[PDB]
């Protein structure tokens, strides 16, 4: 009903002077890819069109952040952007965004690497974030809650089977989500500020996610 093999295929179908300008460029590019990603997640396309909007608008940060963090596993003190460019710890710090960059590095990338999070687990965590019943405006929130329940039950059962020696790997995965949430909110703030000041080029799709509400 909610197969981890299908969620994995959604992830695999998606694989490709101012550092902040380069990071925002990569963000906009991935927003298009994210919409295509969401569709490949079982039952998401079957949700009403308005609810698909509400879901993607509420989680786009966390969804994108999870993606470039897992991509950056084999990177020393930095992140690999979707554009192909690497961005190092010092490059971001010198751009005046080192505090949040280090949070991404320490709380996600690093934590992902040490447990060697696979693409199926990354996909499931992303799918859990996607099916957020707490998203305001949702027409039928219980339907979105039920789809979340099906993703994590599949993820647990995937974990108990693929890594049966690590009895607490399931909870370990789920406990990166508050960090992702916290880091996601702090990104929005930054992005709102890059907008307010106007010293950073911001492409059309990224600009639309920064429009109200």
């Amino acid at each position: 009903d909610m197969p981890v093999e299908r969620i994995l295929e959604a992830e695999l179908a998606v694989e490709p002077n101012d550092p902040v300008t380069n990071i925002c460029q990569a963000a906009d590019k991935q927003l298009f890819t994210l919409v295509e990603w969401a569709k490949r997640i079982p039952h998401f396309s079957e949700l009403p069109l308005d609810d698909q909007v509400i879901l993607l608008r509420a989680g786009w940060n966390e969804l994108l952040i999870a993606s470039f963090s897992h991509r950056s596993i084999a990177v020393k003190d930095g992140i690999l952007l979707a554009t192909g460019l690497h961005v190092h710890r010092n490059s971001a710090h010198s751009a005046g965004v080192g505090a949040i960059f280090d949070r991404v590095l320490t709380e996600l990338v690093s934590k992902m690497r040490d447990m060697q999070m696979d693409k199926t687990e990354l996909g499931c965590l992303r799918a859990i974030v996607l099916f957020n019943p707490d998203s305001k405006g949702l027409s039928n929130p219980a339907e979105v809650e039920a789809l979340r329940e099906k993703v994590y039950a599949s993820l647990e059962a995937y974990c108990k089977h693929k890594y049966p020696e690590q009895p607490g790997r399931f909870a370990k995965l789920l406990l990166r989500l508050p960090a992702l949430r916290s880091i996601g909110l702090k990104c929005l703030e930054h992005l709102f500020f890059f907008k307010l000041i106007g010293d950073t080029p911001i492409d059309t799709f990224l600009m639309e996610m920064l429009e109200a509400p």
């Binding site: 298009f32 919409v35 295509e36 569709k39 069109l49 698909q52 909007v53 993607l56 608008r57 059309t204 799709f205 639309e208 996610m209 429009e211």
Partner: peptide
């Protein structure tokens, strides 16, 4: 409201 997103969620 959300122009680009709606157009991409189409089909």
């Amino acid at each position: 409201k959300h122009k680009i997103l709606h157009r991409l969620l189409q089909d």
